[model samples]
Target: AITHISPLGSMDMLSQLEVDMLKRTASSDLYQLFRNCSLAVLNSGSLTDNSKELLSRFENFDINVLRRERGVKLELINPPEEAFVDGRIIRALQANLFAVLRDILFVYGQIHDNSVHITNLVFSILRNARALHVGEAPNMVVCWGGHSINENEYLYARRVGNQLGLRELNICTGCGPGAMEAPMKGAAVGHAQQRYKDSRFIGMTEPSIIAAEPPNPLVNELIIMPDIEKRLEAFVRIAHGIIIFPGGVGTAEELLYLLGILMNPANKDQVLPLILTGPKESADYFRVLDEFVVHTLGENARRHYRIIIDDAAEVARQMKKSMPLVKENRRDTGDAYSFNWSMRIAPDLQMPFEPSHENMANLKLYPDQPVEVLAADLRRAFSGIVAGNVKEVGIRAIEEFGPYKINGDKEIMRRMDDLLQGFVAQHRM
Candidate 1:
């Protein structure tokens, strides 16, 4: 039951070369990548986070890019039925499918162009996706948390989102379920109550993790980064503030990345407001995380973010109150309101870290190094664990070769082990 679907708004046309690149055989990486991403979009709302399981369940699924004289159309073969209603593909899913095509093709074409700096490259990807606005105010709050959170935690996140929405703030997230979906859902209700017509629920994701956490139905604006590094960069650059909820290794990776960047002397004066919060019951979650941070990266890292317990309205107020400062800083520094261009990010933080065995084993997790450098390595450690937990490649690697051995300073290693065990005990992972 193959069906032909046309783009709604994201894209209208593609070059012949791009079409050829996408239409290559299943054996080709480009084709496989496109196929997997398309399947992920089509399978939105699915509960499973395992990419391998998703692919196995839809072994017959296939997507082809059909180029015509006027424009391009997608031919979906055996797509998940949930993406359809009354025998027609869901409009949001259609847009997301085309977004997948848009981002993958754009990155493939742009990577060969030698003139683009990595940061500017991220800007271009966002700009081309129509994510960056020229004269918009600073209100985008990036929310980070795990997809495996409990019902109460999800509701708490939604409450926070409601407060943010009432304050006329937009929501941006990793673009999956749980914490991501809850905030967007709450914000939508808030926007409706406030009679705000132009609300943005931006979802940013990379190809590697998209299958595990597909773009939730609430995401009105979806932008896919080429890799996790760029995805992390995109979040910080566009965010006026960041709110972290209780999450597992992935969330830890994000927190470390931000801490590492802010620790740089160059960004000492940057005005990026960061808050960690959850329900009253989740206090212990933050406690463990804070202990891990203090023991591994020192008290300075703990100073980078504030921890608030169970006060959703206050969290929203804090972010709203800090908005003017963010704007003032941007104005004083001559940085764009939509993007933070002045913040300094080192090459180590910006470059992609492949979670291979050797790379993971060789990571310098010792505290003797600079805090920022140590933060980068620790971030990589959590990243590798994330890969092993859910990513197809990492999962397969773990199956083929036992577990990754992470060598670090004894105190850091012991603290990390305890923190991870706590996450396991609480089922945060």
Candidate 2:
């Protein structure tokens, strides 16, 4: 039922050490990681966001890197037939699949197995993906939002992208449709009209999410991290600014992850521009979100980010103006322009989170804990819901058992429940 296939591109060359590490099927190497992510790329547009389902759908799917006299090729078996049309491949998926191959081999074969520390490994992966750059102003803005957004909201996202592009800023996103697609679409025109010769549209994603939300054709640079936590870290470390569009539970999970790091006591001085913006029609949407933030994290946590409705140009201008502060801070601290090495990331933020039912049930969501600690736990709670709602593994677990019960302070639970309900009311979920 499985067949061999050859991959053409940059993953052709590999050292014996690299090959051995990749071939180490018995260990926590990149073999399985590579296969999952590669399959995700091939299985784009899967209706479900569940990783467990994705894997189950292609249970026998496997990808292996084959070394030869001429370099390297991929041996893919039981791949999604949709990737090919009349035996000819779709170009976008092809490019992304090759990118998966390249990053997986590079990270496992070169970065992870090296003597470098964990933080340095992150940087090394960025460099390999050509995501990090030097001597450049901070124009990159990471956009986060829902993949299942509607037409009006998606248009609003595009407008924001246009404004940012007009200001000559680069864009980054999870590289899916809906909100993610809008900005890139707008920015392309902005770049052309402004005659901006060099611009980057970077997409950061992991395997689990990629299958449900396939990378749009606009993404030129794609990097697949080992897991969701690393993927989140990559976004925070590389972003000079971030814009949040209207989205669903997955968007909430992303917001919580960023806030958890920012709330850390050691990160008080850290300044990462955060904006939650949408069309004027969505004013009530943010009200619930803001109320949730204020009620749970207190008034001080409200200061961490700003919400501006219906002003895409102003949002772009704010991000453009804030670049100097980011640049100066990086320079004064002697951090590299390509990466923010100086930022303090607590181990809590770095550790991978398993959204298992037990972990979800055990999450300490009460407000008695320090705001920073609560932020991390709250992040996990949302992550669990996100996994259950869309992720393959979480969905299957929920199907096998039942809905995850999230326990917390009554007030916090109420606020959280209201916010999630608001997301559904707005069709963001």
Candidate 3:
């Protein structure tokens, strides 16, 4: 076990009291939560999905917040060896460590009672992280996909990201491995080729899921939302366009969440761009997802996005083309180009869905309801399954309670089961 001291590389200037608050919080009831997040950041680039395994191996790890006259510092007792370079911390990991500290201390103090201002809560978190770029063009593209994907799909993500960066579009993702890392890596090359030095690679993550997929080194801006629901809300609110890669339940959860919002009658005029894409080898993967969408979410849901197979340049070109239209829609609706404030996200989507056995089984995946509601509940089904698969809390719950048994309409359940089976067959789950 190795101990280390690292200054807070970057954070908003904090008052002494705020610094004290962080110390008190990190040293008290929030200690375990803070410790786990810090461990994940230190273990960046490690290809491990099991947080329990990591925690078990590093049971002696601990973090203490230290106050500085300027802001603060962190005392890491027994941090992961991978985070160090000749005794100094890896630059990205150091920065991400402080980010974890800043966000964990920042969000819990914001447990709010206002139900209607959920959008504002998300916006505030992004703004506090300085993630919201005002008076800027609509060029932020959110990439969603499996972190455990194969080599071919990984290469395809890189190609698409290279093209996107050539057009000067930046990236945001779950900030983990596979599709997330590939795009950022390829985009780094593309941005350099274009002589763009100030491009942003933002990584959005949550508490329970961070250990499974830590931030890649390419992530310059990292924000840790409180839970999966808020994290998903943050992505949709901050993205101009979202590209879905060949992921399993997590990617499907993301798509359904956005489609649920877009299908909202209140949001019918929203002009955000969405795309489903991968290499030719992954065409069957996209087909399974698309058919599942139609089988449950109806034809209206299919209208929100298009499929692009093995064409990286076209994927970039299409997104580049959609940028101005997104701007026009923002202009037309008086919404900020930075955050889509005018769009209506349902309250149900904002509330965190616990992945208990009961919650999973009770999801209404039928067609009789509004397509938006159906999509939201369907999104919940995927979310619960994902938690059960990788999240530390979900995995423990599964061990004690057995699997989450999902019950829905006969046809919808069959298609959902088949889609998940396809994910397994492709080695994506």
Candidate 4:
């Protein structure tokens, strides 16, 4: 059944032009985009990662931007029942629905018009979301891991989050299930015990992947970037520190992006602390990742992060201890605590790499190039695989063209194969 709903608090006003722009009959692309994202938010807690399946299951689902005399309301046609409790839409889901509309329109109407640089555009979107606030000390910790993680790994991540929360640090993540939700869940408890009310479990995602990995209900603040490139940039920019748990190719892709940026000579002094951790049972996971990093990027890349196993308390303490140094470094460099403007991301890393088969094959993955350059290509390789595994376009491309072919240096290829096979064997993919 179709239902009319209004925004809770995320948005309250919309101009006539905005309403016309969002009208389905008028702007097919924008309307579909908004509908798809809003549906993803409404379909929270779903177990599947297939966007096509989700869309097909809810084929009749539609949303309209209805203009009212004083403001705007959303008319949801055939929205998922999971979003409703006793005939009233879940407050968080409603806010997230409007968040989809707010961000999509803002990106198209404001950010693109006002900004030319990628970083500036990222900042604009985040600022518009009210994600960036002044005068706050650095406490946002960005947690990265796979949404399809094992139970043990998920529990360990939650324990780590609890420790971090006990120290009053806020949690940020890709905002899906599994590892992303674990930390936020644990932190919520920790925050309550400490009587902390301003806990922020910010979830950041892009449109292409959001349907497959809907924003977990625990995400208090959600920001959707224009694309995956901007999404990665947003994660690194606002993060005071980063904690990586066991994940699949997407997590590896994120690690490579961060390592590539950190390895740049210009950003050698950057103090973004990174830690890779999991339960004792998942030690092999980190071992494989470490070996792969050393084989391809060399021992220097290993220095960029620390490997901690089965000790959530230690991980939290390490991250908390590093807070002072991050603050000092930012103060010395005149970088704002709200956003990391000092990190020198290379043009290759900053530029969007569409995961087409041609682009994937054309990647310069040889180690003869600079390590950072090699990391960039390697990142793209994993990115392609991630798309193939979950993203609709990538899945369709694979269905039509077969799996993406990744060729590189003999040694690098061998290591890559081993790492990927490990992921597959463990069902991390």
Top candidate on TM-score is: 4
Clashing pairs in 2: 7-74, 12-72, 49-390, 50-390, 50-391, 50-392, 51-391, 51-392, 52-392, 52-393
Count of backbone collisions within predicted model 3:
0
* TM-score of every candidate: 0.96, 0.88, 0.95, 0.96
All models: lDDT? 0.86, 0.78, 0.84, 0.86
TM-score for candidate 4: 0.96
Model 1 misplacement above 4 A: 68-70, 113-116, 134-136
**Model 2, position 112: C-alpha lDDT score:** 29
- Point out the higher-scoring one by lDDT: 2 or 4: 4
Clashing pairs in 4: none
Whole-model lDDT for model 4 versus the true structure? 0.86
Q: TM-score winner between 2 and 3, please give it.
A: 3
Model 2 worst lDDT window (10 residues): 108-117
Q: State the TM-score for model 3.
A: 0.95
- Which scores greater on lDDT, model 2 or model 3? 3
